[PDB]
């Protein structure tokens, strides 16, 4: 099947289009779950074809970055340390380590938070928890026509997960703490209503983070 | 739990009203101070130009 995907990835016009199948995660899963020599080699071949045949720079960056959102580069270093006798493994590992060696710098920004929002993977992650991010960047919640605010608002509107809800309330609390105009922006977006409703959420972690956000929103 | 959250909300309400009263007190004081400063500078500048012309 990954040989079928490697063959599909021979054309630049196919690599531009194949993105909508969400194929990099399933190859990255097998790349962790299956160290078999053939399987390793044909994933490296498929990943090399996707990235290298992407003549569109956005598509090249997107394949390198999707592999880095799957953290493929660390597994390629594990596979570089693993014993393999084949140059068609070794040289395609080193190729992808170099190209994903670009997009690792893009992801390992504060944008690991941007990707956690974009993917909906809200958690008590180090970049959610650390003050430095908000202290240096909180205003950026307004970027791409308020995209990160719109995500947090939608998650506070329709998420089922009390961690996501409480994380988002914490994110709103630090957003207002580190960007004062952010209070006005949440008040203009009406996002406060979600936080004020989640004061009576069924989870004490949500209720606590909702109250804490109401404190950081209304109290100096 | 939830009555004690309402006690904390009442403390927050008291802080909000108190610091709002402090902001009113500060701005009302700084209004009268900057009235004394600005009137005093403005009269004393123009009065002294008139004094030398005559």
UniProtKB/TrEMBL annotation, chain A:
Keywords: Hydrogen ion transport, Ion transport, Transport. GO terms for molecular function: proton-transporting ATPase activity, rotational mechanism. GO terms for cellular component: vacuolar proton-transporting V-type ATPase, V1 domain. Transmembrane segments: none annotated. Residues 107-220 form the ATPase V1 complex subunit H C-terminal domain. Subunit of the V1 complex of vacuolar(H+)-ATPase (V-ATPase), a multisubunit enzyme composed of a peripheral complex (V1) that hydrolyzes ATP and a membrane integral complex (V0) that translocates protons. V-ATPase is responsible for acidifying and maintaining the pH of intracellular compartments. V-ATPase is a heteromultimeric enzyme made up of two complexes: the ATP-hydrolytic V1 complex and the proton translocation V0 complex. Belongs to the V-ATPase H subunit family. This is V-type proton ATPase subunit H. It comes from Rattus norvegicus. The lineage of its organism: Eukaryota, Metazoa, Chordata, Craniata, Vertebrata.
């Amino acid at each position: 099947m990954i040989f079928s995907i490697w063959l599909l990835a021979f054309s630049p016009q196919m690599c531009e289009h194949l993105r909508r199948y969400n194929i990099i995660p399933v190859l990255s899963d097998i790349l962790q779950e299956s160290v078999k020599e053939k399987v390793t080699r044909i994933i490296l071949a498929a990943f090399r074809n996707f990235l290298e045949k992407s003549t569109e720079r956005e598509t090249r960056q997107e394949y390198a970055l999707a592999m880095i959102q799957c953290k493929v580069l660390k597994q390629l270093e594990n596979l570089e340390q693993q014993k393999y006798d084949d140059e068609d493994i070794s040289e395609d590992i080193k190729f992808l380590l170099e190209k994903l060696g670009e997009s690792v710098q893009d992801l390992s920004s504060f944008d690991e938070y941007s990707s956690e929002l974009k993917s909906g993977r809200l958690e008590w992650s180090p970049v959610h928890k650390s003050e430095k991010f908000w202290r240096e960047n909180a205003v950026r919640l307004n970027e791409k026509n308020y995209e990160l605010l719109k995500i947090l608002t939608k998650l506070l509107e329709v998420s089922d997960d009390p961690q996501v809800l409480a994380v988002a309330a914490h994110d709103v609390g630090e957003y207002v703490r580190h960007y004062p105009r952010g209070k006005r922006v949440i008040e203009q977006l009406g996002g406060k209503q979600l936080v004020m409703n989640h004061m009576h959420h069924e989870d004490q972690q949500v209720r606590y983070n909702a109250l804490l956000a109401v404190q950081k929103l209304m109290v100096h | 739990s939830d009555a004690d959250v309402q006690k904390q909300i009442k403390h927050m309400m008291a802080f909000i009203e108190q610091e709002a009263n402090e902001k009113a007190e500060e701005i009302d004081a700084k209004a009268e101070e900057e009235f004394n400063i600005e009137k005093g500078r403005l009269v004393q500048t123009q009065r002294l130009k008139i004094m030398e012309y005559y």
